[PDB]
Ligand binder design. Structure first.
Ligand SMILES: CCn1nc(C)cc1C(=O)Nc1nc2cc(C(N)=O)ccc2n1CCCCn1c(NC(=O)c2cc(C)nn2CC)nc2cc(C(N)=O)ccc21
Ligand SMILES: [Ca+2]
Ligand SMILES: [Ca+2]
Lengths: 179, 177
């Protein structure tokens, strides 16, 4: 009995499969303004944060204060999407469309619902499974694996999410320019 | 690999568990107006349509012409009240809506990479029903706030009549027990 299968498939079929196609161009559009104005460009990929503690806060800033909301992204000329700037020592070091995964929140709710019989150990196993399954789905999906990137991580002590995101953005740019 | 397990748990945790508590009261209120005008009442339960074919239309009246939209419901998420008709006469009224996760099972069966056949879609649809049933069977006051209407449509069927069967059964239960 694995709720993570359905959660992954439903996140893809109901949300990613629909929103991603518009994206790769919507960001291309925005970067006209962004490049001309702030002398920086937004990464093309949609970054999906997958905290394995299934802890999705209301806003990204609360979890890490170096992730800072920048600007809402427009639609192609019913979905809101937020550009966040990543920070280092107060300086802008990257920008990206970055959002938490709703399925993970369901797993947290389940672990606080006693009639589920769903322990924290169960919750973590199912979070990992959600990650692996969504990976498999995007692997066989067209231009979608290319339009979005998954960032799974386990908090220990103190941890830096802005840094883990910047790792990925810098890797993405490395790829863009090399190949 | 049963997607229906996750789909059921997500439908309950992320949606039903949220709107049902409000709903009991919201309809309790609305009926103050309905009783005064037209001598009609709206059932307290939320009726969830589970077509086994997973065919969800964009407007219920297209699925059965005897199911006319009546009125949207106010808040304490959009829910719609429908009148069920017989020979043009109003025979019932209820908050009515489709289980949207079935849409997902439909999309999957039209998505070739998934290997999700129509046989699969039907198995997972039935399973979605059984799983959500169980969930509401352990849930507090929630089983009481809504009713599941799972039906399989025939090669050789009235939805408004299926629903009306349930509503009349509900009223029977109300006045006897
Ligand atoms: C967990 C909920 N549920 N589970 C399943 C399975 C089906 C549903 C379900 O019934 N849902 C839903 N019924 C609604 C009816 C009304 C009403 N009455 O009007 C208003 C809102 C309603 N909702 C919530 C909106 C869902 C769409 N949605 C998502 N969904 C996901 O992430 C997600 C997680 C899993 C698993 N599967 N999915 C895809 C369906 N993310 C969004 C982000 C934005 C944005 N960026 O603004 C906008 C919409 C978004
Ligand atoms: Ca190059
Ligand atoms: Ca049908």
């Amino acid at each position: 009995f694995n709720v993570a299968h359905g959660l992954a498939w439903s996140y893809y079929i109901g949300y990613l499969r629909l929103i991603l196609p518009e994206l790769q161009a919507r960001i291309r559009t925005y970067n006209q303004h962004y490049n001309n104005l702030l002398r920086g460009a937004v990464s093309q990929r949609l970054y999906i944060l997958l905290p394995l503690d299934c802890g999705v806060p209301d806003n990204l800033s609360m979890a890490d204060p170096n992730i800072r909301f920048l600007d809402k992204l427009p639609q192609q000329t019913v979905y809101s999407n937020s550009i966040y700037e990543l920070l280092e020592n107060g300086q802008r070091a990257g920008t990206c469309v970055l959002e938490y995964a709703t399925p993970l929140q369901t797993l947290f709710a389940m672990s606080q619902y006693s009639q589920a019989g769903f322990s924290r150990e169960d919750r973590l196993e199912q979070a990992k499974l959600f990650c692996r399954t969504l990976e498999d789905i995007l692997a066989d999906a067209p231009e979608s694996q290319n339009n979005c990137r998954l960032i799974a991580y386990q908090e220990p002590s103190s941890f830096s999410l802005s840094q883990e995101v910047l790792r990925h953005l810098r890797q993405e740019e490395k790829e863009e320019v090399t190949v």
